[PDB]
Design a protein around this ligand. Structure first.
Ligand code: CLA
Ligand code: CLA
Ligand code: CLA
Ligand code: CLA
Ligand code: CLA
Ligand code: CLA
Ligand code: CLA
Ligand code: CLA
Ligand SMILES: CCCCCCCCCCCCCCCC(=O)OC[C@H](CO[C@@H]1O[C@H](CS(=O)(=O)O)[C@@H](O)[C@H](O)[C@H]1O)OC(=O)CCCCCCCCCCCCCCC
Ligand SMILES: CCCCCCCCCCCCCCCC(=O)OC[C@H](COP(=O)(O)OC[C@@H](O)CO)OC(=O)CCCCCCCCCCCCCCC
Ligand code: SF4
Ligand code: SF4
Lengths: 80, 143, 165, 157, 94, 741
């Protein structure tokens, strides 16, 4: 169970959502950027910590951050 | 107006000869996932567990271990065969929970009616200092 | 004598070392003819060894108990005892050549930095400009001192990027 | 045209395959007739048999390779060594039973390859493992003791 | 699982859809002789308790100490045996 | 249909426009060198034709031209070797005294005291002692004179020019089409008979008309300047008949099926020539003729433009059984459309062949005065071992590359590849278990012996005196080969090699070959070799089998073949790609080959190489291998410490260079550790501080300096590690063998 956070620096490019391999992020309406959408992490319990979302964020600094925390059977990617 | 579609147990599985990379003992005591899709023709596809299977013409059901495997298969179907699927989580007791297309709309598309969970209204460097939250089981990002 | 060191001219170990090296070379030479190629090569090596030892003893180098030359790296100590050519003069020579190359590179980088496409100028060097700047780099001490006293040799700390502490 | 390799129990989405090594009739019969795969037999008796076999087969190594193998009293020393090894693997079995069986949970059912529902092996229980561990001690020590007797008897040897 | 065709998933029979099979287990209560079974269950009567079975292991611990204080000397172990002369060392030492 | 020559005219223009635009082949390298990573990327993808274009025809054309360029480079190298042997060598003097004069083909200039490297090899010559074995090869070919070597060098230069012209012509003027490259049947038919068969027949002809007479006179004892020239023997059956009487009959016995008449120069003796210590040239001639006939016959199996012949696709699709479902179907399509699969197969067999060559060459010295040249023997064996190991690792790498890029599930359904990929877990688990079992039962034995020896209990060790581990199978096979002549080979006068048993073959007072007895130490070292090979195979096979997907990462194929990881999630996915598996396999291959060469060196110095004094054989190390190779301490002291005194005491002599490299290599190896235990973040931050220092003086470069990528860091570390280790062993081996050989 990692901690995923989204900051107002996001431009709503939706790249982090498309790069997530476990469907943890989604786009919700917003009004702080031209795209009128912000990213969110409603299913952080399924986050594995690959940080693929950070590698896709184009803002400087990153608008999406993943802080690895307590490891679970899902966050560790264990199939056994 | 969207409701989670129920999981049909009468859906046939794709033609596969079997492999050693399938479900193990975790699915019997913890949980497993099921991905169901609709194909317009019988065609060969690559399974996330190794090998090649043949999806039938119509409804197809595939049970995998982790949710990432189901999502990878869905990505392959969407980018190769333009097929949309649904992912569910099944527990040993018999409970099915809808997953990925949560509100019928893909997460990459805004739907206006979702939960803006975990969205700070500050910058990455505007977090509290680690010394200001000492002796508290929380990181500076949770304030 | 500086730090208990004996001049190589009066060093017995130095002479013994020269004698032993020449002796080994002659021993190897004895297994050949008088005008063959290996004989001529060995004779040339013997001549070079003798010339090297004679030059070291004549240059005033200092030898230790082991009979090998020692260098004095200390201004004043080397200047008053005639050993400025050991480290002092070589230090000046290096500093000059090193500064020459460094200044030439700095000038080339600053000159091409104003071009519309500097990265290409860095991977594809401008030979005429590089040659001119290499020649101009010989007056690097004067130019560097002038730029320092002028204030153009440095970049303001407020204009250089820095980490968020 | 025959395919000797089939998915485990016809299901091709389980991490296992049926090969002439796993689904062979003779192999399946021999493997099913072992004391470990007897859901209806008391765990104590199965443990006694397992301990007897293991204790008997564990003397030989120290007899022919121990530090005192070149001495006439090697058989006795090895009998004691096997007894010690049996006691060690005994405490191992007890620790495993105390750690594995310490809680209860509504586990999923168990069926045969045909689909006939069968109860879980009593050996996989707090009391089942304890009885199996106790039988392993008696059988293990008896097997080591019999290993020494065979050395004295057995006209060929 | 209701694998009558190509369906390997069944919520009403989820037990068979997760591969929960004994594979080799077989229930049969007719095998060990009653007279021999009674002897063994009788020999391992009270040894079925954790505290009591650990006591048997404790005997092994006593045997370990017994070997060091007696068994090692009876097998003529080199460490418990005597020593012959000695050496002086590199220089004038001992 | 119908095999033919299909070619495209003037496809690429010849100019220097692209020479002034680095990175033109890659689309991603078009934005220019914004950072220093671009420079490394320019070289890391120069030969990755699969990325530069999506057309298979262009890739095939590039491969063909690259092959021509490589051939030209090899020809230039050969020309240099012949030129150095003709102008800066003592080959002519070495011919008159091949047992005392040490071969030398390199002369250094006197600049900074380096003239000390010009050793007194002999024959009034000074130079560097060579260990390539070129002198023995030339002697076996009957070169005799230096003018012939110069002519060969000029011919090699002409051939190099022809190769380069061929590459340019086939890439810019007449480029073959894709259908021309996919003619596997025609290619195999021409490479089997027209290449191997014809080449073997031509070499046999040269040996009959040049090598046999000249070498026979040399062995009988005749001054090299007095032997008739090769043309005097090739075009004069009278003199050649004087040397070989069967030649008085001409070619009549060959066409009348009375080949027995040619038994004088086409013998099947065996063993080695007692005068030169090498194989009988007549036996080699007969061998080449037989293999030439076999290859020519084999080059007529595949069907081309006529009805006769077999079809590779038909043969492959017809081999299917009950345990493999569909069988070999789809393999023809994979091997006719993917260059990486062919490269993997070829590299694996090529490296295995190199290893087999090393074995057969030390066992049966094929050149005269080669066995007695211990330096050349050890150098050739070690060099071929390293080439084979590297090629095998490359084979695994390309197998993984094919599985990542060219694999197609729709074309490989229920076939061998699909079935193998469907049970990779069982294969990997069993290979892992066998590797663990081998490691235990192989290294633990050495550890047990060390502990017993240190505890004062030598009677409890695994040696020939205490618990014996005799290799009964190897000894049985060896004795079977020794008893083969006159029984299971009646027409053989002697065994293939003296190692199987028998008498001692010594030349010039030095043992050329002798029986090699196998004991407990040999058993232990052989199991160590098996364990190391198994671990290397496990790493490479695991990478190839899991290159596409895995339980941890189900979409590993999407990430590519060469990627650093998949983030710190799931506990960590560092080095999860196939490239990383190859990176680790390189280290394990180095370990395996190192132990192999160490075993060979110690065994030959203790039980083979030595001197004969009419009272026995005085080996170099006195036979300490049979009593010390059973413990690690023995290998460290009796082999590493005892034999290293030759390289650490070479200063002030001709071998001083070996003493310098020995240290230099030690440095490079240690240098590699910096790149193997570090990370990219640390160096990037350090570079940030250095960049600040540069900006403070207005000397910061526009091409933003960046730390080497994770993959590049691993590549640099592995390259330096292997270079340092291999160079250290090279210097140690050469100095030791050149000082005691
Ligand atoms: C890099 C450090 C360094 C060190 C450790 C020394 C050390 C020494 N210097 Mg020296 N020197 C240095 C730098 C250094 N120097 C430089 C950069 C210059 C050029 C300006 C000189 C020029 C110099 C001269 C002209 C002389 C020395 C002398 C000496 C010796 C006695 C002077 C002394 O230390 O009394 C105490 C120092 C106090 C400041 C008090 C002494 C061993 C003297 C000597 O040769 O000894 C007889 C001498 O006259 N030095
Ligand atoms: C390092 C391995 C090892 C060693 C040294 C021995 C050594 C020995 N075994 Mg043994 N055994 C082994 C492994 C080993 N075994 C294994 C793996 C099994 C199968 C699990 C067996 C099963 C076995 C049986 C059934 C018997 C022996 C017996 C014996 C003894 C008879 C020797 C003789 O006199 O002839 C001997 C001391 C015989 C005996 O009399 O026991 C003392 C006997 O009947 N062994
Ligand atoms: C640190 C404490 C320690 C001690 C006190 C010992 C003591 C001993 N070791 Mg051991 N060992 C140790 C650590 C230790 N080890 C470790 C860390 C390792 C792994 C590297 C090993 C690996 C090792 C091996 C491979 C072997 C020994 C063996 C032995 C025995 C020596 C041979 C002998 O006396 O005949 C025989 C010993 C006896 C007759 C007395 C032991 C039986 C007692 C009485 C148990 C009583 C229980 C009873 C049946 C109920 C001896 C009792 C040898 C041996 O014989 O195995 C036992 C031998 O094969 N050791
Ligand atoms: C392909 C492999 C190869 C290698 C590794 C060498 C290596 C060497 N050669 Mg050689 N050479 C080769 C091929 C090779 N050669 C071929 C194919 C020929 C026939 C043309 C020659 C003809 C040749 C001659 C005539 C000489 C050497 C010499 C040398 C040595 C010094 C070279 C040097 O530093 O000159 C200088 C380095 C330069 C960068 C200047 C080179 C200028 C030329 C003209 C460039 C040509 C392009 C050196 C060890 C010299 C030697 O052996 O010294 C005793 C020597 O005189 N070589
Ligand atoms: C003077 C003759 C000539 C000229 C003008 C060209 C010109 C061109 N060629 Mg071409 N080519 C030639 C000869 C020539 N070629 C020959 C003889 C061959 C056979 C080997 C080829 C095979 C060939 C291929 C397969 C390809 C080209 C391509 C190209 C085009 C761009 C690539 C390029 O040149 O980058 C610059 C190349 C260099 C500056 C030199 C390359 C590196 C050399 C060969 C390494 C030699 C190794 C050397 C010994 C160092 C190794 C050891 C060292 C560490 C000590 C370009 C217009 C490419 C193309 O069409 O683009 C799509 C293409 O793929 N050429
Ligand atoms: C008898 C016919 C013949 C012969 C002798 C060869 C020989 C060779 N081929 Mg080739 N090939 C042939 C037919 C033949 N091929 C046919 C019919 C096809 C189409 C199906 C191909 C397609 C093909 C490909 C795709 C490749 C080769 C390659 C090679 C070289 C491999 C390098 C090597 O290890 O050998 C040893 C090296 C030597 C012996 C050097 C000496 C070279 C001499 C001059 C032999 C030249 C033979 C040539 C066919 C003569 C005709 C050319 C003429 C028009 C001038 C080799 C020289 C590979 C290569 O490296 O490219 C060059 C490669 O990529 N061949
Ligand atoms: C490619 C290998 C090769 C080559 C080039 C030669 C060449 C030669 N051999 Mg020879 N030979 C060879 C292999 C070879 N041999 C082998 C393997 C054996 C063992 C069986 C022999 C055994 C042998 C004997 C016993 C004799 C020769 C002799 C000769 C010389 C005259 C024979 C001849 O027919 O003229 C040249 C041959 C050719 C030009 C081959 C051309 C192919 C056909 C026939 C012509 C073109 C095809 C046609 C138009 C249709 C000649 C220089 C005779 C000699 O004079 O001794 C010195 C002699 O007595 N050879
Ligand atoms: C016939 C042999 C052969 C061929 C044709 C290829 C061809 C290819 N390989 Mg490959 N490979 C081989 C053998 C071969 N390999 C072997 C034996 C190994 C085991 C080591 C590998 C391991 C390997 C890996 C791991 C990879 C490739 C890759 C590639 C592809 C890109 C190569 C490239 O441009 O990178 C650039 C080439 C260079 C930068 C040349 C650098 C030379 C090295 C680093 C220096 C070594 C020093 C040298 C020994 C001299 C030392 C002296 C020094 C002090 C000056 C290419 C199609 C890459 C790929 O992506 O595949 C698609 C890939 O990552 N290969
Ligand atoms: C240092 C510390 C040493 C500690 C020593 C502990 C010894 C074990 C102990 O006391 O157990 C206490 C238990 C208590 O049981 C109890 O026995 C009670 C009866 S009585 O109290 O023993 O009379 C009974 O009522 C109760 O159900 C039962 O639990 O008593 C036993 O059952 C021990 C019997 C042991 C019989 C097996 C011996 C080994 C056989 C080897 C076979 C081959 C050998 C050749
Ligand atoms: C020491 C020997 C060196 C080799 C190492 C052996 C260890 C490897 C064990 C792994 C086995 C994996 C089983 C795969 C299972 C498998 O591949 O499926 C079964 C396989 C498939 O055959 P099919 O009937 O499908 O045939 C159709 C084929 O054309 C298509 O593949 O048939 C075999 O039995 C292969 C033989 C495997 C056994 C190899 C041992 C051969 C003995 C060699 C003995 C040499 C020394 C004694 C000589 C006197
Ligand atoms: S770390 Fe990976 S799993 Fe977690 S939100 Fe980012 S992309 Fe998704
Ligand atoms: S990648 Fe970054 S900018 Fe784009 S939607 Fe996600 S958080 Fe916002």
């Amino acid at each position: 169970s990692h901690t995923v956070k989204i900051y107002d620096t996001c431009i709503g490019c939706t790249q982090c959502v498309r790069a997530c391999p476990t469907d943890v992020l989604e786009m919700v309406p917003w009004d702080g950027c031209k795209a009128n959408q912000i990213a969110s992490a409603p299913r952080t319990e399924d986050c594995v910590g690959c940080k693929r979302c950070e590698s896709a964020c184009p803002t400087d600094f990153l608008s999406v951050r993943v802080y690895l925390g307590s490891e679970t059977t899902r966050s560790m990617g264990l199939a056994y | 107006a969207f409701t989670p579609p129920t999981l049909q147990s009468d859906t046939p599985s794709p033609i596969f000869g079997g492999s050693t990379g399938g479900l193990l003992s975790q699915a019997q005591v913890e949980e497993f996932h099921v991905i169901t899709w609709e194909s317009k023709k019988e065609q060969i596809f690559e399974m996330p567990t190794g090998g090649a299977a043949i999806m039938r013409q119509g409804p197809n059901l595939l049970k995998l271990a982790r949710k990432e495997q189901c999502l990878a298969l869905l990505t392959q179907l969407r980018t190769k065969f333009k097929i949309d699927g649904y992912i569910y989580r099944v527990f040993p007791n018999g409970e099915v929970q809808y997953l990925h297309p949560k509100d019928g709309v893909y997460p990459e598309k805004v739907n206006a009616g979702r939960s803006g969970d975990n969205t700070n209204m500050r910058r990455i460097g505007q977090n509290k200092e680690p010394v200001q939250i000492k002796f508290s089981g929380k990181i500076p990002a949770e304030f | 004598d500086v730090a208990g060191l004996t001049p190589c001219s009066e060093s017995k170990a130095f002479a013994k070392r020269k004698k032993n090296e020449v002796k080994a070379l002659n021993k190897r030479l004895k297994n050949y003819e008088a005008d063959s190629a290996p004989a001529l090569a060995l004779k040339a090596t013997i001549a070079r060894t003798e010339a090297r030892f004679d030059k070291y003893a004549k240059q005033g180098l200092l030898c230790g108990t082991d009979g090998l030359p020692h260098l004095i790296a200390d201004p004043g100590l080397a200047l008053r005892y005639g050993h400025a050519g050991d480290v002092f003069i070589p230090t000046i020579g290096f500093i000059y050549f090193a500064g020459w190359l460094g200044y030439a590179g700095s000038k080339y980088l600053q000159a091409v930095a104003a071009t519309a496409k500097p990265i290409e100028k860095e991977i594809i060097i401008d030979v005429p400009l590089a040659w001119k700047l290499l020649w101009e780099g010989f007056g690097w001490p004067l130019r560097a001192f002038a730029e320092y006293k002028n204030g153009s040799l440095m970049e303001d700390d407020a204009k250089i990027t820095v980490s968020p502490r | 045209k025959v395919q000797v390799v089939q998915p485990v129990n016809g299901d091709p989405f389980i991490g296992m395959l049926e090969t002439p090594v796993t689904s062979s009739p003779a192999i399946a019969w021999y493997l099913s007739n072992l004391p470990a795969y007897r859901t209806g037999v008391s765990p104590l008796l199965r443990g006694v048999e397992i301990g007897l076999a293991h204790g008997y087969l564990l003397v030989g190594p120290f007899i022919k390779l121990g530090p005192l193998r070149d001495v006439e009293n090697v058989a006795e020393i090895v009998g004691c060594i096997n007894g010690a090894a049996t006691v060690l693997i005994l405490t191992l079995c007890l620790a495993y039973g105390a750690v594995t069986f310490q809680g209860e949970g509504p586990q999923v059912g168990v069926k045969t390859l045909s689909g006939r529902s069968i109860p879980r092996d009593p050996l996989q229980s707090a009391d089942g493992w304890n009885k199996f561990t106790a039988g392993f001690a008696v059988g293990g020590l008896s097997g080591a003791a019999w290993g020494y007797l065979c050395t004295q008897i057995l006209p060929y040897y | 699982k209701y694998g009558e065709e190509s369906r390997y998933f069944d919520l009403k029979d989820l037990e068979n859809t997760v591969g929960s099979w004994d594979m080799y287990g077989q229930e049969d209560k007719s095998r060990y002789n009653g007279l021999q079974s009674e002897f063994f269950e009788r020999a391992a009567n009270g040894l079925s308790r954790r505290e009591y079975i650990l006591g048997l292991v404790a005997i092994g611990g006593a045997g370990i100490l017994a070997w060091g204080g007696k068994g090692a000397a009876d097998v003529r172990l080199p460490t418990v045996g005597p020593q012959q002369p000695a050496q002086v060392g590199p220089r004038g030492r001992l | 249909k119908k095999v033919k020559i299909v070619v495209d005219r003037n496809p690429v223009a010849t100019n220097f426009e692209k020479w002034a635009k680095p990175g033109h082949f890659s689309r991603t390298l078009s934005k220019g060198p914004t950072t220093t990573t671009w420079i490394w990327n320019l070289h890391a993808d120069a030969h990755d034709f699969d990325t530069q274009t999506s057309d298979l025809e262009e890739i095939s054309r590039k491969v063909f031209s690259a092959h021509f360029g490589q051939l030209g480079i090899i020809f230039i190298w050969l020309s240099g070797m012949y030129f150095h042997g003709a102008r800066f060598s003592n080959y002519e003097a070495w011919l008159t005294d091949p047992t005392h004069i040490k071969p030398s083909a390199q002369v250094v200039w006197p600049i900074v005291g380096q003239e000390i490297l010009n050793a007194d090899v002999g024959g009034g010559f000074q130079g560097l002692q060579i260990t390539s074995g070129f002198f023995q090869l030339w002697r076996a070919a009957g070169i005799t004179s230096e003018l012939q070597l110069y002519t060969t060098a000029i011919g090699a230069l002409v051939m190099a020019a022809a190769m380069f012209f061929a590459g340019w012509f086939h890439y810019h003027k007449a480029a073959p089409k894709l259908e021309w490259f996919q003619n596997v049947e025609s290619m195999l038919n021409h490479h089997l008979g027209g290449l191997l068969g014809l080449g073997s027949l031509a070499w046999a002809g040269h040996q009959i008309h040049v090598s046999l007479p000249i070498n026979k006179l040399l062995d009988a004892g005749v001054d090299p300047k007095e032997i008739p020239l090769p043309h005097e023997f090739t075009l004069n059956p009278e003199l050649m008949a004087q040397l070989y009487p069967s030649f008085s009959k001409g070619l009549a016995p060959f066409f009348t099926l009375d080949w027995a008449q040619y038994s004088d120069f086409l013998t099947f003796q065996g063993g080695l020539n007692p005068v030169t210590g090498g194989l009988w040239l007549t036996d080699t001639v007969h061998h080449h003729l037989a293999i030439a006939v076999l290859f020519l016959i084999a080059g007529h199996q595949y069907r081309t433009n006529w009805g006769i012949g077999s079809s590779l696709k038909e043969i492959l699709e017809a081999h299917k059984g009950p345990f493999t479902g569909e069988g070999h179907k789809g393999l023809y399509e994979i091997l006719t459309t993917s260059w990486h699969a062919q490269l993997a197969i070829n590299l694996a067999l090529f490296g295995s062949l190199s290893i087999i060559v090393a074995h057969h060459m030390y066992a049966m010295p094929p050149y005269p005065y080669l066995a007695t040249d211990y330096g050349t023997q050890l150098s050739l064996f070690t060099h071929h071992m390293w080439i084979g190991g590297f090629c095998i690792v490359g084979a695994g790498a390309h197998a993984a590359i094919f599985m990542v890029r060219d694999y197609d599930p729709t074309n490989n359904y229920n076939n061998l590849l699909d079935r193998v990929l469907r049970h990779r877990d069982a294969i990997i688990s069993h290979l892992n278990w066998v590797c663990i079992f081998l490691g235990f039962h192989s290294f633990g034995l050495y550890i047990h012996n060390d502990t017993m020896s240190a505890l004062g209990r030598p009677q409890d060790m695994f040696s020939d005196t205490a618990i014996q581990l005799q290799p009964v199978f190897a000894q049985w096979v060896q004795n079977t080969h020794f008893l083969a002549p006159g029984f299971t080979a009646p027409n053989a006068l002697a065994s293939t090699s003296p190692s199987w048993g028998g008498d001692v073959v010594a030349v010039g007072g030095k043992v050329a070959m002798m029986p090699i007895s196998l004991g407990t130490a040999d058993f232990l070292v052989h199991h160590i070799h098996a364990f190391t090979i198994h671990v290397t195979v496990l790493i490479l096979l695991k990478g190839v089998l899991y290159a596409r997907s895995s339980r941890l990462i189900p979409d590993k194929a999407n990430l590519g073949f060469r990627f650093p990881c998949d983030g710190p999630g799931r506990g960590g996915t560092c080095q999860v790609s196939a490239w990383d598996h190859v990176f680790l396999g390189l280290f394990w291959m180095y370990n395996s080959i190192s132990i192999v060469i160490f075993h060979f060196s110690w065994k030959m110095q203790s039980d083979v190489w030595g001197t004969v004094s009419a009272n026995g054989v005085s080996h170099i190390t006195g036979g300490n291998f049979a009593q010390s190779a059973n413990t690690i301490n023995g290998w460290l002291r009796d082999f590493l410490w005892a034999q290293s005194s030759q390289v650490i005491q070479s200063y002030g002599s001709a071998l001083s260079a070996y003493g310098l490299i020995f240290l230099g290599a030690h440095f490079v190896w240690a240098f590699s550790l910096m790149f193997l235990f570090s990370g990219r973040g640390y160096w990037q931050e350090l570079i940030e501080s250095i960049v600040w220092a540069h900006n403070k003086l207005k000397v910061a470069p526009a091409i933003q300096p960046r730390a080497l990528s994770i993959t590049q860091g691993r590549a640099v570390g592995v390259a330096h590690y292997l270079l340092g280790g291999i160079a250290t062993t090279w210097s140690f081996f050469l100095a030791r063998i050149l000082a005691v050989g």
